[PDB]
């Protein structure tokens, strides 16, 4: 008995672990569980590749499951780690299986940086090992038949899934062994051999000759088509070709011998003889020409015994005419066999070591959701602040609401009194003065950290350069200059950040000293404050003036509008939607993730109720300011201009402006502080990254 199998492809060993670990750590928070279990996984993955591929040796189902295990695992990894985005220099190198190319060689290799290459090759080896296990089977035996029939149909299916898979993965020309045409021929050889096994099972089980003829004819159909595919392309080892031809003939002769036993049974005697004669011719021919590859004697003895016995009976008794082959009905065909679809998992007891890991597709949708959400929220905050700033400025330049609460010109208007006490409560000028004083100190701290860090790199570099000059032979590591350039680039980066911060300190210093004194007044206790604001005569027709009640009410609703901006801002900030689960769904039920359309509709459900109100705020402000200014323009006409109330008038406008400035400055000075504090965080880490690289070197 002789069946075709395929030899395994050889690979060079490659470290799977360390290029994958580089990513894992750059993805998740260092020193955590979501980074612990994945490094334990990527190293066991590297080991598994070694057991699956590292040696072409073992030859039974123990080593096959390990190969299948590896196939399934590699297919499970793909949607995680970013392979569909070329930048990992994990490059796989395989040899052609058959020592075959489209050039005059002895061997040919292909190194490729692709998982699609890795998985075609593993699959091919899965297929090939399966073919070898099948060929080894004892076909006298019911477990043998069965294991052979299942392995050939596996190989055929694996070979065929490679055929439909190679090109779109392998963005190159594949080695001959894994190219569509070869792999389509291998698939058909494996299917033909499965049919062969089923023909043997039916024979062993003493099934009807009509069934056996049809299973054998079908096997011949498969073998003939594979033979034909080989006739004008030599891509398989040298033995494949004549074995296909012999097996094609043997399966025809079998078809004919069984159909002959059918003709006899039906008393078609000349037909028995013509079919036996054909069987004999085919087998005579197989024995002379393919003697090296098959043994066919028993079958030939059996044909001859049948032929002689049938010719004795015909010549003496029946006198039936022997027809020509061309006038005989075709024997039918019956396939019992199929190419096994490839569907991960193909191994028994499979578990994805990286199942818990989130697909890359989701990150580049979860991080992208963030940049759209952030755009929307900041945008909204900024619009509102910029609006409130503009309203307060307009109000101040019109002495509102002070003017309308200014009964005489003798006391502190209630609103200025409210703002004053509000400034005093927040600590008065002491709080601004203290924050101004420490801003140069939080700057200096950060400069010290950046500078101490770069000094380190410099020190180490100097001694490294001096050791290379003196101990040329004893001292050859890559220079410090080169190891350090990545860190030195973060260095000059941080420098740029610190400069923009200094410029920002400028704006805040200039503002603070330009507004200090008026603020100091606003913070004085109420009787003292009153004495410093000039008195004036009331323009007494401010009883229940209608131009006043309108201004009062317009200003009240403008107030309403700006207090409402605070809750809007806080709710804009306090809410969030975790979007992972949505993306999980969109990916598991559909092909890919369409984040653009999916996030926009979610941002609209979560933030729409708020972005609506924010836009309604601006328009409402625009309405209010327009007719506040046409209403004031009338109000000023009624109450005249002398210098006693002009002076009081400026002092009041300037006191309202002082309040806006205390408020703007406290906030700028806190933004400054937080910035300079969070920058010490980032820079302490940087100091450690520098001391670590100088301690290892």
């Amino acid at each position: 008995a002789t069946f075709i199998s395929v030899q395994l492809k050889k690979t060079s060993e490659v470290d799977l672990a360390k290029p994958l670990v580089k990513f894992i750590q750059q993805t998740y928070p260092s020193g955590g569980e979501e980074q612990a279990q994945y490094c334990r996984a990527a190293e066991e993955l590297s080991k598994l590749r070694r057991a699956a591929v590292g040696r072409p040796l073992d030859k039974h189902e123990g080593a096959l499951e390990t190969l299948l295990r590896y196939y399934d695992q590699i297919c499970s990894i793909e949607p995680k780690f970013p392979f569909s985005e070329n930048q990992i220099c994990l490059t796989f190198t395989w040899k052609d299986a058959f020592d075959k190319g489209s050039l005059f060689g002895g061997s040919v290799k292909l190194a490729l940086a692709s998982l699609g290459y890795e998985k075609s090759c593993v699959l091919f080896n899965c297929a090939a090992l399966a073919s070898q296990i099948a060929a080894e089977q004892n076909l006298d035996n019911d477990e043998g038949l069965k294991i052979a029939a299942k392995h050939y149909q596996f190989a055929s299916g694996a070979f065929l899934h490679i055929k439909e898979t190679v090109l779109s993965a392998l963005s190159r020309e594949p080695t001959v062994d894994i190219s569509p045409d070869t792999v389509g021929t291998l698939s058909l050889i494996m299917l033909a051999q499965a049919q062969e096994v089923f023909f043997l099972k039916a024979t062993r089980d003493k099934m009807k000759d009509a069934i056996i003829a049809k299973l054998a004819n079908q096997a011949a159909d498969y073998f003939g088509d594979a033979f034909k595919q080989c006739q004008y392309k030599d891509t398989l080892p040298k033995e494949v070709f004549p074995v296909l031809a012999a097996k094609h003939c043997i399966m025809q002769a079998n078809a004919e011998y069984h159909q002959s036993i059918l003709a006899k049974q039906q008393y078609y005697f000349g037909e028995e003889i013509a079919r036996l004669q054909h069987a004999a011719e085919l087998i005579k021919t197989v024995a002379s020409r393919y003697d090296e590859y098959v043994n066919v004697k028993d079958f030939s003895d059996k044909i001859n015994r049948a032929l002689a016995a049938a010719k004795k009976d015909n010549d003496f008794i029946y006198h039936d005419r022997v027809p020509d082959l061309k006038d005989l009905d075709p024997i039918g065909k019956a396939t019992l066999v199929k190419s096994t679809p490839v569907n991960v998992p193909i191994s028994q007891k499979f578990t994805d070591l990286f199942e818990k890991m989130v697909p890359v597709s989701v990150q580049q949708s979860l991080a992208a959701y963030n940049q759209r959400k952030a755009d929307l929220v900041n945008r909204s905050i900024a619009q509102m602040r910029e609006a409130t700033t503009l309203a307060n400025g307009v109000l101040a330049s019109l002495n509102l609401p002070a003017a309308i609460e200014d009964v005489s010109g003798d006391t502190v208007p209630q609103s200025i009194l409210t703002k004053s006490r509000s400034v005093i409560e927040q600590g008065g000028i002491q709080t601004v003065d203290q924050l101004i004083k420490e801003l140069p100190e939080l700057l200096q701290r950060n400069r010290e950290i950046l500078d101490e860090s770069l000094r380190l790199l410099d020190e180490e570099e100097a001694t490294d350069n001096d050791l290379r000059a003196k101990f040329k032979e004893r001292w050859q590591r890559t220079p410090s200059n080169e190891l350090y350039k990545p860190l030195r680039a973060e260095g000059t980066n941080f420098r740029t950040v610190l400069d923009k911060a200094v410029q920002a300190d400028g704006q805040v210093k200039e503002c603070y000293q330009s507004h200090r004194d008026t603020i100091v007044l606003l913070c004085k206790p109420e009787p003292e404050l009153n004495a410093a604001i000039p008195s004036a005569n009331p323009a007494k027709t401010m009883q229940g003036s209608e131009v006043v009640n309108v201004l009062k009410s317009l200003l009240s609703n403008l107030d309403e509008v700006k207090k409402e901006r605070e809750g809007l801002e806080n709710d804009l900030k306090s809410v969030n939607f975790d979007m992972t689960s949505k993306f999980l769904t969109a990916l598991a039920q559909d092909g890919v993730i369409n984040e653009e359309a999916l996030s926009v509709t979610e941002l609209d459900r979560v933030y729409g109720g708020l972005t609506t109100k924010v836009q309604e705020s601006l328009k409402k402000q625009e309405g209010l300011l327009k007719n506040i200014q046409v209403s004031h323009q009338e109000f000023s006409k009624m109450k005249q201009s002398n210098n006693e109330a002009n002076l009081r008038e400026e002092v009041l406008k300037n006191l309202a402006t002082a309040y806006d400035n205390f408020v703007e400055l406290v906030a700028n000075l806190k933004e400054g502080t937080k910035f300079y504090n969070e920058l010490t965080e980032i820079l302490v880490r940087f100091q450690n990254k520098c001391s670590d690289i100088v301690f290892a070197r």
Binding site: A504, E671, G672
Partner: peptide, 11 residues
């Protein structure tokens, strides 16, 4: 923007 909270956050 006053202080470079943009540069700081992406770091």
């Amino acid at each position: 923007e006053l202080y470079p909270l943009a540069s700081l956050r992406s770091l």
